[PDB]
Each structure stands twice: as structure tokens, then as C-alpha cells.
């Protein structure tokens, strides 16, 4: 996933 979109 996108790390800057905190999962």
C-alpha cells in the first residue's frame, strides 16, 4: 500500500 496513506 501507500506508506504516506498510513494503513
Amino acid at each position, epitope marked *: 500500500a501507500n506508506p*504516506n*496513506a498510513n494503513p
Partner: antibody
Amino acid sequence: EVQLLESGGGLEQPGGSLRLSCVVSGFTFSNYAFNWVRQAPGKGLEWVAIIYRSGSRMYHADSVKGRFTISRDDSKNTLFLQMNNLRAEDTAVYYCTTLLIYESDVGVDFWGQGTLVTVSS
Amino acid sequence: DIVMTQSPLSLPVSPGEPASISCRSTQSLIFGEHNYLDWYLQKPGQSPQLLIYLASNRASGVPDRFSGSGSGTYFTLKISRVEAEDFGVYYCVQTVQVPYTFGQGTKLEIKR
């Protein structure tokens, strides 16, 4: 004011090398992942690579794997893309970008202006 | 890889009329409680601009004409009433799995 300023592009022959640089200002560079995205003239956007804020996790796209290398120097708040063994189809505007940053329940996104790489003999 | 299919590829719309752009994935984009699909608008000679993030959330500064919807593999961006400045090419991109992939882009044209 956040600004992502790209440089290092220009003209190079096939098989040559270029090194792109993206200096990030007004932004906590070390805390975020960064991406490289390129766009061939008239064509669409293509994701190239990602490096996480850790620096140990990084990924490259299949089309450029083994030839391009993404890296970061956190001490200078700068992102790099080392381009070796350049091919004609690498001609594109290259953007550094965080892509989506989603934290404190708000969404933001920052992009550089892009720098043009032309690969031809 | 994951293939993002945008439809249509060209979208002529008169100003004031609604527009609808779809984005299809070959694999579910869900991770946790979010769908990792973003919508971008790129005007000629400019950098891409975030419009909708995580499938249905309007980015800061984007006008209320823009909205996003969908889940799983089917997502839709809608403009209730297009205006002159919304012309350009719209891209979706998934970030649920590397390699990140973009759609082909949808060119929103002026319907004369």
C-alpha cells in the same frame, strides 16, 4: 510554502547515464515516502519507483528495474533517481512526488514541476 | 501487475452538463477501511493535481462539482456541472499494491 524542485535532466545518448535530483523545502522530508513518476511526450503517467521514509524499503517498476535506482539523502532533504543504460523510451518528463499523504484525517499531495530527459543517438 | 482501465478515453461535455468517468481495476484495491484509488487532473503544461483521494474523499481546495465513489474494482468520478476550467485529462491511480499503475487517462473535451 512547500516546493519540490527537480533538476539533472537533459539530453543523453542511449546507454548513457543521468542522475535526477529533487530537493524538498518547507517540508519534513525525512518522515515521508517519495516517488518518481514519468510521462512520455503526449503519453500518460507511469509510476517509476518508491522509497519509504525508512530508506530500507524501496521499489522500482518492471520497465526500469535494474537500470534505474531510487535513493535518498535525508541529511540534505533530497531525493535521487540514478538512470543508467538509458533507452530511447525513457524520454519523458520526470516528476518527484509524495503522492497521497493522509494523516490527521486530512488529505494532501505535493508534486514537483518535472524535468525533461531526452534519450536519443 | 494491476491494470487500470478508464472509460471513456475521450469525454466531450458541454459546459453546465454533468460528466462521469469510471476506473476499473483487475484486483481489489481495498486495504483495511480504505480503497487506495486517487483521482488526478492534469492540464496541458502543468503538473497533475489531486482531486479525489481514497476513492470518495474530496481533496482540499477542490470545488463541490467533484465527487468520487466506488469500492473494490469499480470507481467513478463525477462532475455535477462541468465548468470551463475542468477541461483536461483525468487519471486514476491505485496505490494498494506495487507496482503503482495509472489509468490510460480520460480527456474531457469541449462539446461544441
